[PDB]
From a paper:
Finally, a filamentous form comprises monomer units (typically 2–6) assembled around a continuous DNA duplex with an interface again comprising eight [name] and four [name] subunits but in a different configuration to the dimer complex. Although the filaments were few in number, of variable in length, and less well ordered, some preliminary analysis was possible. A structure for the basic unit of the filaments, comprising two monomers and an interface between them, was obtained at 7.7-Å resolution. This filament repeat structure shows differences to the free dimers. First, the DNA running through the complex is a single continuous duplex that spans ∼70 bp. Second, the interface between monomers contains a pair of Cas14-Cas22 dimers but in a different configuration to the dimer. Attempts to morph between the two dimer complexes, to model the conformational changes required to interchange between them, revealed that the changes required were too extensive to be a simple, one-step conversion between these forms. It is therefore unclear whether the filaments can transition in some way to release dimers or whether monomers are released that then reassemble into dimers.
[name]-Cas is a set of microbial adaptive immune systems characterized by the insertion of short viral- or plasmid-derived DNA fragments called spacers into the [name] regions in the microbe’s chromosome. However, the type II-A [name]-Cas systems of [name] and Streptococcus pyogenes encode four Cas proteins: Cas9; [name]; [name]; and [name], all of which are essential for adaptation in vivo (Heler et al., 2015, Wei et al., 2015). We show that the Cas9, [name], [name], and [name] proteins of a [name] type II-A [name]-Cas system form a complex and provide cryoelectron microscopy (cryo-EM) structures of three different assemblies. The structures we present here shed light on the initial stages of spacer capture and reveal an unprecedented higher order assembly of [name]-[name]-[name] proteins that appears to play a role in this process.
Residue numbers in the entry:
A (entry chain P), D (entry chain O): 3 to 289
B (entry chain Q): 100 to 110
C (entry chain D): 1 to 219
E (entry chain C): 1 to 218
């Protein structure tokens, strides 16, 4: 699917003739399933049928369920996306710590390099030079924590020294919202690959289902940081709409200009292929 | 041909 | 006699009496507005077994029970014809009535012969006697239940009305009266469709949830 | 929670006053939220509300969705306050090879013993004595392949020497149908346990995605072959009608006479708990 | 205004908007029968602030909202007479209308004299001009919420009707639409009384229990 459908209104959803049926008292509209990529329910008054959920699982469409506050609550995870998952589990169990730490280190280097590119586009020479120094100083096992220092200096330089990631302000709320959406898309891509999402490539002690999808989604955070930095003065609703405009906007991949969903799918495919082939090629994404 | 389809308030 | 709207997945068949309950006030008001505007709007489509769409003139819509006029020229004419047929089915009563009419015609004929002017006449028939008697249905003292029952009785007299529909008419009648209305509708064979916002307990009906799911309900 | 709510019939679900409202054509039932533990939807005609999905996200209860085939398709994944089953999958990833070989050998011994006992009920002493000899001769790592040797004896005894599993006939299709139903039930039980069905007990073949449930359902397989042997002359439709009555029929568990669903549930629970606790007790089922 | 029946202990007053719920189906159907038969039956009574009985002609009873025609012979007669009075209040405008009508009558009279057949005419009047223009209230209603608003406008325009009564008309409107109808009734000052079989949640209404006792709600 190419289309992200967001339903914030109370209505009923049915599945008829390979077609999503939106039935409401005011109007009714039918949208084909093949064109639909992601389905987002932003309200608790929406009704749906289990048959349409089964058709969405067969169509491999990500379904997101939000709360009354409109923040995402729980997303649907299919058990078997493809038959290659059961064969990929043995490869994930056969993975090596050198390949995991190497791919994760290269991914963190791509994220820090993207932050230095964002500060370079923002015309900060000292900040991007320091973040570039931390990128050149990144090492295996991360003994210096140059990634966390790059994040602290990045947010502290962008939003001011008094700003912090632990604050309850709408800036951190929008950051966690964009990280939740990108984490949902990357997690759905990991479900398409079939590998276990709970197994991370960095720390084996930390146990989280979103760890792998976060490690894959680390380089794309600065794209959310840019719109969050531009819309920071706007209200949280307009910032959420601008965050929704990221799906409509296109970004330039090394090969050509593509949509965000295609870049995430091809990037995750190259990451899984690189993990199974033990680092044949590392996909690099630049702003 | 719209990428983001919104059924609800148009914000 | 199947009716279909955009909210329904498949066209629902209406046979004898049918109780349709719409739990959503917006879909119910929109459906009733589509019932009054039916000729203008293409959303609500009612078709017979031939799949041919019935005209609004063939559709009979009823909301106010006591405000509707049950006495019409066609209804009273066909009713007088039915009474004439009932009197014609019995030979003895028809013979006696013919005798009395013959006597009255003899008296009036003698009175005409007594006059100086030349007078001519034809006959005094039974339909003219019923029209002179002024036979008509009485809705003045009738209760709402007897009014709806008389409407179900005169629906067979209406030739052009294909289907009768009632809007929120089940709120006045008690459960037993509703059972009598349905049991009488099964004998009358007419097609009646009731639309209520709330479900009635104890009768079979089609329920439309706010989820827009149509389900059969025994109670 | 404790009770596991499963909906096998068409119905609608709502949430009112901390109370789950389940509405079916026959009757309406209201269940407290604290009493429910795991929620499973068997069919595609069930209707649910997103508000009850959000209350389930606050209640941590696991939501399981199934297709028309009854095989579990997708499950609800919350972003925070995850269920304990996701923490229980790590133990399934930690399952030792000795425990898997012990449980697999016990399962094969139970299936072969049930086949020989069924042949004894069919009053064939030589074939049942041979299958019993192969049961007493079964060993770890399966060098003798006594299971594949007892197969041809069991089928050749039941349907005759001319019959085979490779041939295309209504008997083979009926066997695959019964194995599909039992695979759906056992797969639903394994999905209720939370363990990944892609990881199998047999270490040789990872091809099938149901390998865990396919290995757990082996001891109950001959009960299908009995009805298939009695109805073998009937058409495949009549064989499906006869196999559809196994859900209504009651079978004798070691403890007490029970339905097949409860027996498969207790067997699956004992299998999972035994795998996590490294072979405390092995559930044994005999015809 | 107040309404009184044998079931109530004391007559209840109806001021601005009023919602009356009858929990007994027999008392509700018999009450509507007493509403349509009010001229025939003396059981149901209505006493205004002057404590004087009112004829059924002064009571406006409307059950079907969409089935009630806004354009009637009496309504169009009172509207045309009102417009004729407004035009009669200004002598200059009516004089200009008489001049234009005189010009048109002169032109049509000349065309009639040009014809070979004899023609006789009388005159043209302002009432015939209004009836020829087809002046009437707007017949466009998108929903029952707007149609009930037009019924409230025509009811407030009619001086002869002292009360407007709706029977089971609140089931079509949403709670918010009921709030807008109550606020519009309080702004229009007209007396409206509703009769519902069941109670409505969120709004103030008088509940009549099956025990016949009447109790206020909200
Ligand atoms: Ca005559
Ligand atoms: Ca007479």
């Amino acid at each position: 699917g190419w289309r992200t459908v967001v339903v914030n209104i109370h209505s009923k959803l049915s599945y008829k003739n390979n077609h999503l049926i939106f039935r409401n008292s005011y109007k009714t509209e039918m949208i084909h399933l093949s064109e639909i990529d992601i389905l987002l329910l932003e309200t608790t008054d929406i009704v749906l049928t289990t048959m349409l959920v089964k058709r969405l699982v067969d169509e491999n469409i990500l379904v997101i369920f939000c709360d009354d506050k409109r923040l995402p609550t729980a997303f649907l995870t299919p058990y078997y996306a493809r038959h290659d998952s059961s064969l990929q589990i043995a490869r994930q169990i056969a993975w090596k710590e050198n390949v995991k730490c190497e791919v994760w280190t290269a991914i963190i280097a791509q994220k820090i390099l993207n932050q230095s590119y964002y500060l370079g586009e923002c015309s900060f020479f000292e900040k991007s030079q320091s973040i570039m120094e931390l990128y050149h100083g990144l090492e295996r096992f991360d003994p210096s924590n140059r990634e966390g220092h790059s994040a602290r200096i990045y947010f502290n330089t962008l939003f001011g020294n008094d700003f912090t990631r632990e604050s309850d302000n709408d800036i951190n709320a929008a950051l966690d919202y964009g990280y939740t959406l990108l984490l949902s898309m990357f997690a759905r891509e990991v479900v398409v690959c079939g590998c276990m999402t709970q197994i991370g490539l960095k720390h084996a002690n930390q146990f989280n289902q979103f760890n792998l999808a976060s490690d894959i989604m680390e380089p794309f955070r600065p794209i959310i940081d840019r719109i969050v930095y531009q819309n920071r003065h706007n209200n949280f609703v307009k910032i959420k709409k601008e965050l929704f405009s990221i799906f409509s906007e296109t970004y330039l991949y090394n090969g050509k200009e593509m949509y965000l969903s295609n870049i995430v799918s091809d990037y995750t495919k190259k990451v899984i292929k690189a993990l199974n082939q033990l680092g044949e090629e590392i996909p690099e994404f630049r702003i | 041909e719209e990428r983001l389809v919104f059924l609800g308030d148009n914000y | 006699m199947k009716i279909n709207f955009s909210l329904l997945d498949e066209p629902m068949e209406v046979n004898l009496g049918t109780v349709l309950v719409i739990e959503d006030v917006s879909v119910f008001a929109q459906l009733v507005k589509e019932f009054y505007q039916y000729d203008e709007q293409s959303n609500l489509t009612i078709f017979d077994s031939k799949i041919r769409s019935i005209r609004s003139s063939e559709l009979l819509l009823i909301t106010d029970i006591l405000g509707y006029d049950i006495n019409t020229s066609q209804v009273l004419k066909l009713l007088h014809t039915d009474i004439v047929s009932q009197l014609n089915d019995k030979p003895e009563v028809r013979s006696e009535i013919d005798s009395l009419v013959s006597l009255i015609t003899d008296i009036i004929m003698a009175e005409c012969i007594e006059n100086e002017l030349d007078i001519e006449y034809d006959e005094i028939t039974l339909l003219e006697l019923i029209k002179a008697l002024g036979v008509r249905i009485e809705t003045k003292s009738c209760t709402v239940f007897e009014k709806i029952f008389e409407i179900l009785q005169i629906f067979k007299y209406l030739v052009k009305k294909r289907i009768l529909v009632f809007v929120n008419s089940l709120s006045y009648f008690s459960k037993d009266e509703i059972y009598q209305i349905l049991e009488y509708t099964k004998l009358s064979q007419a097609d009646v469709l009731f639309l209520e916002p709330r479900q009635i307990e104890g009768i079979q009906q089609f329920i439309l949830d706010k989820d827009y799911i149509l389900m059969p309900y025994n109670n």
